[PDB]
Amino acid sequence: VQLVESGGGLVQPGGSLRLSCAASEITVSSNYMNWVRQAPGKGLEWVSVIYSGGTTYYADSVKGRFTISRDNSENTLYLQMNSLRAEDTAVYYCARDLMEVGGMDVWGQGTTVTVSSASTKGPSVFPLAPLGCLVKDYFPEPVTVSWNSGALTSGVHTFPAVLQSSGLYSLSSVVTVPSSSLGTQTYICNVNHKPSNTKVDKKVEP
Amino acid sequence: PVLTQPPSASGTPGQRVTISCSGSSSNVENDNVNWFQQQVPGSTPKLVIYNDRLRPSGVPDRFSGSKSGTSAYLAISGLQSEDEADYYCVAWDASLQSYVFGTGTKVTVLRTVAAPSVFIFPPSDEQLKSGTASVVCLLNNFYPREAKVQWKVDNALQSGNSQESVTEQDSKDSTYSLSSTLTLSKADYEKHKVYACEVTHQGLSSPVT
Amino acid sequence: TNLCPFGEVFNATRFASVYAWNRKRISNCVADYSVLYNSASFSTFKCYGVSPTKLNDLCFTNVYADSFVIRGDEVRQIAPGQTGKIADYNYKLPDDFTGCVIAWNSNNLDSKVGGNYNYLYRLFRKSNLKPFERDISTEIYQAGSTPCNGVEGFNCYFPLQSYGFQPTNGVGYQPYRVVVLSFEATVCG
């Protein structure tokens, strides 16, 4: 029972973006379904609802600037966003609004939309020798850091980022390694910045 | 348009915290107030209470709710250690066909104390090689969110850079963690002494390396 | 010289849930349609076609009386080109309608303490209803890949749900009895 948000991120003001939520086990054409958003460090805002038989309802803070739809044949719903503004900079969530017989169950993880200028900034991965990596100077957010692909499921400490006042971000993730025979399994970061489309697999060594 | 809901809530372990949520006679009077829990800003919400007072599946009998006209409430009974989160309330309004969320209340449980395990890593080799430097303090689990960590620098205070993070997170081990970074210049690194990081809780610490 | 039994439908002791819009063929009778609106004890009587007085002066093949009960907020949805749960998944008017929608509050008659939970509203139908169409189906709704096979459960909820009609409820959330007069040799005035 899973909904995966899969839209984009960084968009010049007045631009346009298309958001999508792939659905597992919920027939999107039958169950109401509904988009909700969360601005950076703020509350939750209902964006749009679709109904099974159509008849969309939108929030006044978007109206004509936003449109919602269901892919036919495919179990995905969409939010076409156009005439975007900096207010719209937020995190967007797809969700299943079962009106009364349930509620807004089954929320998605969320795609991170950042409406601004100043362009992307690709990170400069640097190794934190015995152990971790230093994701340096990056814009917009998020960064996906995995250690030895999915192998190191545990010991991981993906600490949150900072705001360098110049607008740049920096993040750093570490693992509590068995100091015993640590020199065996070579430890390799796998960082990906989807906006800059920067994928750096950088190895950390003594 | 919002539903009014207090900013803060507090309670000892075991106590019952009762979140408000008040709105118009077209909002929360009917059309079923729904209640939501979100551990962290970007987190995925979780439906605690629905259709005024009913509960879904997988939700503890602890959580509970009631309605009284202009306002309904959320009764977080048996206050657990993890339950400290941001809580929100929703309702449909035919008047302006929409769903109306709440300001959010941050439940804050008040209990035992923990020690910030602190790890510092030096500038990376080839960061230095780019005419740059930067150093990292990575502070791990601590329960009181307080943590002033102005990089002492040397034995002589210097607060040039030393960029520090808010807090939150851990989630697993529902304590709190944080990050602070002091940038240097390439040649400025070879200025002697190794700066240290004034992790100052109620107590204090300073791995200097 | 038979007069139309509009009263038989209008002042009915017992209406019907919206999901089952009862229809009576008003036929071969006399209708001073004006006296119905002259019975201006009605909240909503808007005739999209023409005023009752003018069509009092008129005749049709037959006249169709559609009687049901909805919630006050949703009286708007019993109108041409209206979008809503009642409109889409319960009762839909053609976008070209030439009749009269009549409504009155019934919080007195059809509300009881605790709730007259005996009025029902369809919450799930995979597709919007066509003009003047009725669905009485009670089959369990499939919101998922998994077929229900007739057990209520997750992704397998029951279609028809019920209004909670309590007197202490708000005005827009109160019983409103609605009669839609449709107009298509019989009946004159």
Residue numbers in the entry:
A (entry chain H): 2 to 131, 143 to 218
B (entry chain L): 2 to 210
C (entry chain R): 333 to 516, 522 to 526
How did the manuscript describe this experimental structure?
Importantly, our results show that the heavy chain plays an important role in the binding to RBD, contributing with ~739 Å2 of the interaction. Further, the structural alignment results showed that the structural conformation of the HCDR was more consistent than that of the light chain (bottom). In addition, the structural comparison of available antibodies from different IGHV germline gene sources showed that most of the antibodies bind to the RBD ridge of the S protein; however, some antibodies were found to target other regions of RBD and did not compete with ACE2. Interestingly, 1E10, targeting another epitope, also showed highly neutralization potency, with IC50 = 21 ng/mL for authentic viruses. Importantly, the neutralization ability of the eight mAbs (targeting the hACE2-binding epitope, epitope 1) was basically consistent with their blocking ability. Although the correlation between HCDR3 lengths and neutralizing activities of SARS-CoV-2 antibodies remains unknown, these results suggest that the sequence features of highly potent nAbs can be clustered and that the heavy chain probably plays an important role in the blocking of the RBD–ACE2 interactions. Recently, the SARS-CoV-2 variants B.1.1.7 (bearing mutations, including N501Y/D614G), B.1.351 (bearing mutations, including K417N/E484K/N501Y/D614G), and P.1 (bearing mutations, including K417T/E484K/N501Y/D614G) have rapidly become the dominant variants in South Africa, UK, and Brazil, respectively. Although the structural analysis in this study was insufficient to fully illustrate the mechanism behind this, based on the blocking and binding abilities determined against different mutants, we speculate that it is most likely mediated by K417N/T mutation.
Neutralizing antibodies (nAbs) have great potential for the prevention and treatment of SARS-CoV-2 infection. The SARS-CoV-2 S protein consists of two functional subunits, S1, which binds to the target receptor in the host cells, and C-terminal S2 (separated by the Furin and S2′ cleavage sites recognized by host proteases), important for the fusion of the viral and cellular membranes. Importantly, blockage of the receptor-binding domain (RBD) of S1 with neutralizing antibodies (nAbs), resulted in inhibiting the entry of SARS-CoV-2 into host cells. In this study, using two phage-display immune libraries based on pooled PBMCs from eight convalescent patients, we obtained ten SARS-CoV-2 nAbs.
